[PDB]
Amino acid sequence: GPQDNPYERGPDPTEDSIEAIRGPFSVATERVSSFASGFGGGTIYYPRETDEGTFGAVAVAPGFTASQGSMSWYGERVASQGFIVFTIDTNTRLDQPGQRGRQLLAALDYLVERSDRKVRERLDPNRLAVMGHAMGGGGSLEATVMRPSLKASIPLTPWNLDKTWGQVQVPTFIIGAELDTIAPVSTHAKPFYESLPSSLPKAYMELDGATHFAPNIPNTTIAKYVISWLKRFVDEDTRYSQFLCPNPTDRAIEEYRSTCPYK
Ligand SMILES: CCOC(=O)CCC(=O)O
Ligand SMILES: [Zn+2]
Ligand SMILES: [Zn+2]
Ligand SMILES: [Zn+2]
Ligand SMILES: [Zn+2]
């Protein structure tokens, strides 16, 4: 309840509520032409309802390789659970994970500093997160080392040649795709997960039979645990602990690793 946590939003969850295509909040959008010079723009998704309090925010980065598939589906799916979601446009000029990390941070800076007042009136600037696909997932990792005050990080089929992440202090949930040949889990996702501190709240979820572009298509297994991770760490909402610990065992999941329980 709200008494023990002022950041709780929405009714008490179930497996069904985390799997829902839309949560309890209706969602509005705001296009942004540019959030920083050189970095391009994106789309902000925000809950319309203000009567439960302000919300944390997640910036969402795409990958590098050409694909008309996108990150847009995360926008309303996640925002409708009570979050501000800023999907960042593709940018072929940013060809390194560190650049995508800086892009993620610039997007968050914009949200906090000078986004439309409708968004800022709904925003808790102290509770921010990053998520990204592929090189953008590498960027999520990079962003957390650059900004350890972030509340959560979700690298989706992440790609990064830097394999060492022992300095990450932000709760990190890595999603891998079994059949990924672009960011293979054996040399990307798994070494990232294993290098994160043993005392970090962390998880690794691998999707059975999934290709590299699985995160670009609506996927309930991804969504339900992304939602649960953001709830648990951006909102400190322990009502969502039930879905994260003990480890998920959904049929769609190849393997799950975690540092449960999350104190
Ligand atoms: C979507 C795949 O593209 C990436 O973001 C990672 C792999 C690459 O940089 O070629
Ligand atoms: Zn409570
Ligand atoms: Zn490193
Ligand atoms: Zn499998
Ligand atoms: Zn369950």
Tokens of 158: 């992440």
Question: Number of folded domains in the chain?
Answer: 1
Distance of CA 183 to the CA centre of its chain: 18
3-class SS string, 241-252:
HHHHCCCCCCCC
Q: Which two tokens stand for residue 122?
A: 């709904």
Give the closest ligand to the alpha carbon of residue 134: 1
**Resolution value (Å, 1 decimal):** 1.3
Domain of residue 244 covers 1-263
Structure token pair of residue 7: 């950041």
- 163 CA → ligand 3 middle, Å: 6
235 is in an annotated binding site: no
Task: Confirm or deny that 186 is annotated as ligand binding.
Answer: no
CA of 127 relative to ligand 5 center, distance in Å: 26
Interstrand relation of 123-133 and 55-61 (parallel, antiparallel or unpaired): parallel
Q: What is the CATH number of the domain that holds 25?
A: 3.40.50.1820
Q: Is 214 in the pocket of ligand 1 (CB under 6 A)?
A: no
What technique was this entry resolved by?
A: X-ray
Q: What is the DSSP letter of 161?
A: S
Query: What's the residue count for the chain?
Result: 263
